[PDB]
Amino acid sequence: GVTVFHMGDSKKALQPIYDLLENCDVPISKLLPTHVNRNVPLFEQALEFARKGGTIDITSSIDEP
Amino acid sequence: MIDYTAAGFTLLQGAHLYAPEDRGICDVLVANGKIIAVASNIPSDIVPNCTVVDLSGQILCPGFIDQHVHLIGGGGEAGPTTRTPEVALSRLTEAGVTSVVGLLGTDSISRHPESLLAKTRALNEEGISAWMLTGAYHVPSRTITGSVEKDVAIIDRVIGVKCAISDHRSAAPDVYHLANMAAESRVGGLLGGKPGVTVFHMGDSKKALQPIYDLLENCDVPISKLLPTHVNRNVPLFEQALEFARKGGTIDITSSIDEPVAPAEGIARAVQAGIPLARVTLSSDGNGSVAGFETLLETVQVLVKDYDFSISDALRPLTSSVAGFLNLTGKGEILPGNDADLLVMTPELRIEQVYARGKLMVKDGKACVKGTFE
Amino acid sequence: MIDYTAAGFTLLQGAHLYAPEDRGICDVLVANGKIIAVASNIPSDIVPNCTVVDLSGQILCPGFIDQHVHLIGGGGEAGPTTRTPEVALSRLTEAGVTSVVGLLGTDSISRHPESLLAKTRALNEEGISAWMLTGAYHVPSRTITGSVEKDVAIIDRVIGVKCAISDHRSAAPDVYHLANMAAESRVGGLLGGKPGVTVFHMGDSKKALQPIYDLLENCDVPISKLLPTHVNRNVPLFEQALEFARKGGTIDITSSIDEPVAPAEGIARAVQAGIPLARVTLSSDGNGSVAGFETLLETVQVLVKDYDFSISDALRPLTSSVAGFLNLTGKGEILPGNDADLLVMTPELRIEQVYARGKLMVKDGKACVKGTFE
Amino acid sequence: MIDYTAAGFTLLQGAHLYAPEDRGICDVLVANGKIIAVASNIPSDIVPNCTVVDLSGQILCPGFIDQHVHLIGGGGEAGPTTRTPEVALSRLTEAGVTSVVGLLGTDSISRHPESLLAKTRALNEEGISAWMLTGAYHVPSRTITGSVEKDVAIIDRVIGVKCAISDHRSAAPDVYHLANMAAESRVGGLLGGKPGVTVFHMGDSKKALQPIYDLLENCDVPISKLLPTHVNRNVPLFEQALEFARKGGTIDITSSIDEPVAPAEGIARAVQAGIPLARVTLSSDGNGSHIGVAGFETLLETVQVLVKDYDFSISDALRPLTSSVAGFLNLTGKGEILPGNDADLLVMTPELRIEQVYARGKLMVKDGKACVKGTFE
């Protein structure tokens, strides 16, 4: 019963997710952001997310940045 | 014969010169405390009474510039017994420090700017280069002349103001008082030809750099003036400091903190993050806590040893980077015109000799010039 | 023979000692105002000139520490006629108070900190232990030296600052002024080896503790420094105080208020709420209103009688809890080293004798040592 | 067994006591930093865990009270480089000093009253007893609370005020600002239970003590509250100093100055002039001012020379450093080794060289070397 988010390049990065956690009680262990390594600040935030309990998903098909 | 020793001519020859940018085996001619020549193989007789010194097989780099030292003492956070003593000249010159920026910490009741100013001037007379930051953790700042802007402006040794945020020992400053403070430091600096920076002592609050960002909104002080320190005190905050450095700001890492982010580990992660070393400096926060200055040279060594930084790149956060942030004209770099602040090291980076404005401070790794009462 | 009475040796033997933690029939050897021994059955000749006293069948516990007393007087909220008089030494020692924290209330125009400081010192000379809080309901605070931080720091008897919020007699303080005030008290405390607390007089506003929460956001002062009082003045507020105590903060209940939440009823509800008694203290707000100190001993009695608290647990909010909150080293607990502040009670908890720093204050339930002009 | 170590019982026995009054082979029982018994032959078992220390063949006397020490440092008269460092605990104790009064000097621009206070308290927590004089050379006085009267009244460790007169580094005060200054220290002293004394730094002006006599003419501060210092810095000032003591004043000689009147010679000339030793104090002027920072040795060296080259009794040589000082500054429980007083005693040899030092019951000097030191020494 997980939710997998396709991360884009918007500056807001993981913001939509944190807002969600504020607006309901879905455990953070069910949200999965993907393509986290598609841009540095999103990957930075990705690390912070994992720190709060989330599990991040990196995609091998992307080599930079 | 005629007497030319007034010029105090000294020639440092045959050393592997790092200025910090790796040059080769270069020679450095010094006169009147100034580096008047830098070109490989200089005549040992080019100038008259020249104290020629053989540095063959040794390293020669710029002396360290430490911008975080409680010169007149600090501490006191646990009663009057915990008030640390003032800093000894030899202590600095032995750690390879030739230029230093004094400041006050938490205690601004038994520690006053007039004393720091005095200690700063006493240091300059004794041989090294010293400046000071006005204020303390406290905001609004307890100044010398009545306003931060006036201090930075007319007190010759003040280059900016200090303060403390996101800490449990602050004065609980609000964005306006904070912004105003920085603006005064900035304006003052222009009027005094000072960098006019604002150094923020970082605490362990969750808020971290939020006040520094909040400040950017409410004023127009260039981000190149806001310097946070102790960013390596907690990882969550360090991470933000990096993001802050990625935006054009500079970050100061204290070599007196070894966890959760060690000094080297700090300078290292920044590079990996893709931050020009230009925006990264290393401070000791010496005589704080009682903190020492050994960790400055140790952070260089470990950087070249444990991590894979080069001698030149390792030195930067302790020289040119610092010099370029405070606009300390003529320092942190070995070129004709700049000050003869030099460090003779072994290939293993162990300070042997130290030169400050021409004068010899450390002879056999032990200062041979000391403060009046050491 | 040789003279040893200089040591003023006194031995309290055969009493049911509560320190407050229920020990058995323990003996307590006192010397030079200090408890130098606590172990059942001590020799009546162990030390030379020893005033041996038979307390068989009596209770022995630490004297009360009352942290809310308008020592030099208070009131005045209805003209100059309503200005209450200063506190009498015998009044305190008879209610079983051996350590007290003075403070000012609403009137800070005809009542000054210099006077309180003076009264505090006069009390210490007379036999008991006294400290004081700087400021008053008014914010920013009217201090002695110019700043709260400086007062708490260098005035030897100031342990923190007071103020008033969510009340119709405040100065309508805003979060910044409030936060700054507490931060100064906190920093000052560290510099002076004082608890550096901030005691908030609670009013009957709907806002209740909201300002104290608002403060936590805007600064980093530990929640262990914010002490609200009179939390039992209205139920809605009391409920919040409990939630506040559940978060690590301490709450002060005034024994001078009997509704809607009586003192005992207050200390009781806290336990039910699951709050370690450690975070609960009981103050009198004596000489306020004219309030008296009888209600302190009455809150203990009623707690052991009407409610089902034990003698030991009942005493805590009036001793160890208080002592541990202000860090009053050597008080609120009977152990070797601590001060000989003692209370001899009947099994029914009716103070018979009182000892303050060794000296005997109350003999037959009536003080035998009084202030200079009683 | 029951634990009585809290009392910190200690039995100093066998020594030849000087309290400073010549006693004989007397004993001294300490408990909780206080002297609780003084009498010959005290039984070693008299109290529980009593740390009995045999001072057989030793001299036991009261600890030194140094009322002129630049605790936070001084100097600076030849530039910021000449600013001396803070005094180290051990430097004092090893000199016999158990009680000290701090003051400021020429420099009150880079030296502050709040710094002297904090330090004065560091030393207190570290084991000895320290007090301080508000103000400095400069008059009016740069103070803590805004008024000299207020400092001497409400700041616990302040016991009076300092100032300089007849010196080329003075602030050039007039009899008015000088008299008002001494009056406030007097009143404030009364209010706070402090000596409320005024200590004058004597210079080399020919006028010598003139400013003082003028003050007595312009107000009613008792002459027993005025204390001229460095009186032995030039002969005619020392001459006048003697006349001053004759009219009731108490003079203060500084051991750190050897000419043109030595410390020992000064205390001796005083006696010869008929001044009671009670009105003669000796201070060190420690840590003020190669350029060299002044030390605390000359103090003991005065007691020694007094007994060895002048005929003063051991008991008499001690007075101007013990009973005399405590008396002038109303230092309760000090300068006297009698029951009730504090355990500030020094253990010496019959040659008057310190061996042990006790401050409020703790051992500061175990073998002529400090076993207790400042937190960063």
Swiss-Prot record, chains B, C:
It is found in: Cytoplasm. One of its GO terms (biological process) is proteolysis. Its cofactor is Zn(2+); Co(2+). InterPro entries: Amidohydro-rel, Isoaspartyl-dipeptidase, Metal-dep_hydrolase_composite, Metal_Hydrolase, Metallo-dep_Hydrolases_sf, Pept_M38_dipep. GO terms for cellular component: cytoplasm; cytosol. Binds 2 Zn(2+) ions per subunit. Has highest activity with Zn(2+) ions, but is also active with Co(2+) ions. Substrate binds at residues 75-77, 106, 137, 169, 233, 289. It comes from the Bacteria. Keywords: Cobalt, Cytoplasm, Hydrolase, Metal-binding, Metalloprotease, Protease, Zinc. Optimum pH is 7.5. Active over a wide pH range. This is Isoaspartyl dipeptidase. It comes from Escherichia coli (strain K12). The lineage of its organism: Bacteria, Pseudomonadati, Pseudomonadota, Gammaproteobacteria, Enterobacterales.
